[PDB]
Amino acid sequence: GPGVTEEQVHHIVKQALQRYSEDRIGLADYALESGGASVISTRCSETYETKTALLSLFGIPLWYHSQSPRVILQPDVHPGNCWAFQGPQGFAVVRLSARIRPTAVTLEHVPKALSPNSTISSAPKDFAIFGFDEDLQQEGTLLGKFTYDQDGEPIQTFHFQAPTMATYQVVELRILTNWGHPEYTCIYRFRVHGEPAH
Amino acid sequence: GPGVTEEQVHHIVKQALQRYSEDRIGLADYALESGGASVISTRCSETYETKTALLSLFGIPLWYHSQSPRVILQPDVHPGNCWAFQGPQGFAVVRLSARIRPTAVTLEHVPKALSPNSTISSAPKDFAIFGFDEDLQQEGTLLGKFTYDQDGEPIQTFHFQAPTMATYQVVELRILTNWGHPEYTCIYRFRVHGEPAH
Amino acid sequence: GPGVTEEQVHHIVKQALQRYSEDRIGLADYALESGGASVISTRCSETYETKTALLSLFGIPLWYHSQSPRVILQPDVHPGNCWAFQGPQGFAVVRLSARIRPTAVTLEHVPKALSPNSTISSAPKDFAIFGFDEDLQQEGTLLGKFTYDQDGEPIQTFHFQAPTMATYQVVELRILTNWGHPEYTCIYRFRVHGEPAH
Ligand SMILES: [K+]
Ligand SMILES: [K+]
Ligand SMILES: [K+]
């Protein structure tokens, strides 16, 4: 009718929070490390230490460990909890927790509001996703190319345009450019969504 | 009056988010490991590895550790962050962070939207809670029996019907059936609420 | 016009959740350990074990570690995830992830609803913040004095009244009183906000 009652607001809020709590976007993530996914270390850009100027000019904390490629499969995305590689090109290969037909990926970066100077120049920009249908993964099939938009929302999801029904258990994230940081690109979290067996 | 103003929506939203941030439900958890609770390892079903078909058929990651019973006392409930035991019956015994009179427990499971095929057949179903008033815990008193509803909300709270005023520092969660998974039952997080001393 | 439409509620809710997800308050934290900050161990009150009465009267779990001063630079603030020192006075010195001009700090404590008896008597109360412009930090300049209000919201932010433009990379949090706990004061998370270089 006219406007909205206090009661329907409560319902809209409760539902929005329930969606928020389903890993924000409500899609199963077959790349999530705790769900059984892993990175193929041997098939990943070399890790770049972003905290150099502090690891030298102040020390190596005793509990301190470099952010490795598995970090992209981990949901903590507080500032710094990103895997960094050198320069604007890099890739990681992920073995998914199940064989799936892939329909979408998600990439997120730390929000501008939480970065120095509100810029995120080390965020990835253009990237592509490849599926490897065999384990002895030499030949990649392009599943899609996309751009992470630095003026968009921190979490962005990308739907493959008309996928085949091919299924895959190993996928690569291949970063083609960044948002212009001259030293490295930082990846906060990469997710892979699709349809499993049965 | 007629409808709701932009201003009262902001207030409803702010309050809902403040409640959301108080561990979702706003009740102290005496089973929370970081608050000083622990599991009595010796008094727990044997742990079942759910990631077998991958731990074999791909490898044992080097950082990898089996999900043990303490995981049920830990708030991270991303997919996979659950303690699994074999078959549909299992139990864990928890030593609470303080001696309390118990009034409710909470059990949660990963949401359907985040599971393969939107089913959660390994969620617990019927279960019971027992208090042990002594440390040399051989004899359990039934505090209540309940069913975790797989079509309900991911977090469910269960109030004991008219508790005595008996106080306890050791409680058991005893799972009686699951939602029909033929190999194991997975527990994401178990909480115990009640009234302390003073 | 008259009231608010279902549609504008959805928009208000979506925005509130996006703000919620930017570390709740939307300001970069230069004290965040994962962002490259650290505590100067050597310049910190001695750590106090709050779980004594259980670490003795039940045991030392095998995975168990005392909550150390770095915990105040870590975003997990579930109950127990606080650094405790003895009595109501204490301090920690933080080396920030970048040299900044400081404009605000944030201090938070666990919410009353999640504590035994709804009281948080171990929360800090009056405190001060000092900047040390040199590394060989002997002389502190008072940046501001404030009170954490135990009847206020769990997260509280404090703006310095007309800061100089002086920049700092090392700051101290100095707690002057607590809310009356006779044995210790517990710090959940301390954040430092300000303007960086460029
Ligand atoms: K991450
Ligand atoms: K858990
Ligand atoms: K903390």
Side-chain angles (χ1 to χ4, degrees):
Chain A
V4 165
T5 61
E6 173 222 296
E7 205 202 347
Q8 53 215 113
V9 172
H10 285 112
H11 297 16
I12 283 159
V13 160
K14 164 142 161 137
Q15 178 174 57
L17 279 174
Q18 200 85 254
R19 291 221 159 285
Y20 186 87
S21 77
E22 306 174 324
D23 201 15
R24 309 275 265 107
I25 67 185
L27 310 174
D29 181 5
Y30 292 90
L32 188 59
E33 179 179 69
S34 65
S38 68
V39 68
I40 300 187
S41 306
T42 149
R43 263 294 272 151
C44 282
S45 310
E46 271 216 304
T47 297
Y48 177 87
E49 174 57 61
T50 64
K51 271 103 186 125
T52 280
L54 302 154
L55 272 173
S56 82
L57 276 5
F58 291 122
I60 296 86
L62 277 175
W63 38 267
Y64 182 87
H65 287 310
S66 275
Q67 291 289 294
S68 80
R70 28 201 295 257
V71 158
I72 69 182
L73 307 186
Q74 288 173 351
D76 177 342
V77 293
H78 295 90
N81 282 333
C82 57
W83 175 55
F85 54 85
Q86 211 192 83
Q89 282 88 46
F91 46 85
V93 172
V94 176
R95 179 195 333 285
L96 301 185
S97 54
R99 183 175 200 85
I100 67 176
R101 181 209 188 190
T103 47
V105 292
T106 294
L107 201 52
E108 67 186 287
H109 200 78
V110 58
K112 279 175 185 180
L114 300 189
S115 332
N117 295 313
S118 302
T119 62
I120 45 168
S121 57
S122 63
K125 185 153 174 323
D126 296 291
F127 67 93
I129 309 306
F130 297 88
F132 292 79
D133 85 329
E134 26 123 35
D135 58 344
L136 191 78
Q137 47 95 3
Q138 34 71 60
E139 261 310 45
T141 323
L142 180 59
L143 274 19
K145 282 211 185 195
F146 304 105
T147 300
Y148 179 85
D149 171 9
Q150 77 168 345
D151 298 328
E153 286 184 19
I155 303 169
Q156 296 165 31
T157 295
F158 304 86
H159 288 268
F160 295 126
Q161 192 70 247
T164 42
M165 229 74 61
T167 71
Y168 301 101
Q169 200 161 2
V170 171
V171 155
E172 174 193 343
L173 168 67
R174 187 170 312 169
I175 310 300
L176 315 169
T177 56
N178 68 23
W179 274 96
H181 200 277
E183 276 144 10
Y184 61 81
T185 307
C186 232
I187 306 293
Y188 276 77
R189 176 172 176 208
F190 172 56
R191 317 179 199 198
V192 180
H193 311 298
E195 311 150 348
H198 301 274
Chain B
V4 165
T5 61
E6 173 222 296
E7 205 202 347
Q8 53 215 113
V9 172
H10 285 112
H11 297 16
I12 283 159
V13 160
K14 164 142 161 137
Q15 178 174 57
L17 279 174
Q18 200 85 254
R19 291 221 159 285
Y20 186 87
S21 77
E22 306 174 324
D23 201 15
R24 309 275 265 107
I25 67 185
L27 310 174
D29 181 5
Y30 292 90
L32 188 59
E33 179 179 69
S34 65
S38 68
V39 68
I40 300 187
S41 306
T42 149
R43 263 294 272 151
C44 282
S45 310
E46 271 216 304
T47 297
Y48 177 87
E49 174 57 61
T50 64
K51 271 103 186 125
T52 280
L54 302 154
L55 272 173
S56 82
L57 276 5
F58 291 122
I60 296 86
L62 277 175
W63 38 267
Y64 182 87
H65 287 310
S66 275
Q67 291 289 294
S68 80
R70 28 201 295 257
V71 158
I72 69 182
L73 307 186
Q74 288 173 351
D76 177 342
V77 293
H78 295 90
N81 282 333
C82 57
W83 175 55
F85 54 85
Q86 211 192 83
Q89 282 88 46
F91 46 85
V93 172
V94 176
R95 179 195 333 285
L96 301 185
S97 54
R99 183 175 200 85
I100 67 176
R101 181 209 188 190
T103 47
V105 292
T106 294
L107 201 52
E108 67 186 287
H109 200 78
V110 58
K112 279 175 185 180
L114 300 189
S115 332
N117 295 313
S118 302
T119 62
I120 45 168
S121 57
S122 63
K125 185 153 174 323
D126 296 291
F127 67 93
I129 309 306
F130 297 88
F132 292 79
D133 85 329
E134 26 123 35
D135 58 344
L136 191 78
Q137 47 95 3
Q138 34 71 60
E139 261 310 45
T141 323
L142 180 59
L143 274 19
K145 282 211 185 195
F146 304 105
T147 300
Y148 179 85
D149 171 9
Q150 77 168 345
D151 298 328
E153 286 184 19
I155 303 169
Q156 296 165 31
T157 295
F158 304 86
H159 288 268
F160 295 126
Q161 192 70 247
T164 42
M165 229 74 61
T167 71
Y168 301 101
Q169 200 161 2
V170 171
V171 155
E172 174 193 343
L173 168 67
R174 187 170 312 169
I175 310 300
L176 315 169
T177 56
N178 68 23
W179 274 96
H181 200 277
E183 276 144 10
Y184 61 81
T185 307
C186 232
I187 306 293
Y188 276 77
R189 176 172 176 208
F190 172 56
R191 317 179 199 198
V192 180
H193 311 298
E195 311 150 348
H198 301 274
Chain C
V4 165
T5 61
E6 173 222 296
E7 205 202 347
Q8 53 215 113
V9 172
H10 285 112
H11 297 16
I12 283 159
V13 160
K14 164 142 161 137
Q15 178 174 57
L17 279 174
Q18 200 85 254
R19 291 221 159 285
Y20 186 87
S21 77
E22 306 174 324
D23 201 15
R24 309 275 265 107
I25 67 185
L27 310 174
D29 181 5
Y30 292 90
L32 188 59
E33 179 179 69
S34 65
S38 68
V39 68
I40 300 187
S41 306
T42 149
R43 263 294 272 151
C44 282
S45 310
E46 271 216 304
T47 297
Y48 177 87
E49 174 57 61
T50 64
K51 271 103 186 125
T52 280
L54 302 154
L55 272 173
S56 82
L57 276 5
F58 291 122
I60 296 85
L62 277 175
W63 38 267
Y64 182 87
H65 287 310
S66 275
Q67 291 289 294
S68 80
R70 28 201 295 257
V71 158
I72 69 182
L73 307 186
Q74 288 173 351
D76 177 342
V77 293
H78 295 90
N81 282 333
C82 57
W83 175 55
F85 54 85
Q86 211 192 83
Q89 282 88 46
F91 46 85
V93 172
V94 176
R95 179 195 333 285
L96 301 185
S97 54
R99 183 175 200 85
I100 67 176
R101 181 209 188 190
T103 47
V105 292
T106 294
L107 201 52
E108 67 186 287
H109 200 78
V110 58
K112 279 175 185 180
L114 300 189
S115 332
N117 295 313
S118 302
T119 62
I120 45 168
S121 57
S122 63
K125 185 153 174 323
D126 296 291
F127 67 93
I129 309 306
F130 297 88
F132 292 79
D133 85 329
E134 26 123 35
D135 58 344
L136 191 78
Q137 47 95 3
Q138 34 71 60
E139 261 310 45
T141 323
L142 180 59
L143 274 19
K145 282 211 185 195
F146 304 105
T147 300
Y148 179 85
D149 171 9
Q150 77 168 345
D151 298 328
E153 286 184 19
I155 303 169
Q156 296 165 31
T157 295
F158 304 86
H159 288 268
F160 295 126
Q161 192 70 247
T164 42
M165 229 74 61
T167 71
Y168 301 101
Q169 200 161 2
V170 171
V171 155
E172 174 193 343
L173 168 67
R174 187 170 312 169
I175 310 300
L176 315 169
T177 56
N178 68 23
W179 274 96
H181 200 277
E183 276 144 10
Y184 61 81
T185 307
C186 232
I187 306 293
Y188 276 77
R189 176 172 176 208
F190 172 56
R191 317 179 199 198
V192 180
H193 311 298
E195 311 150 348
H198 301 274

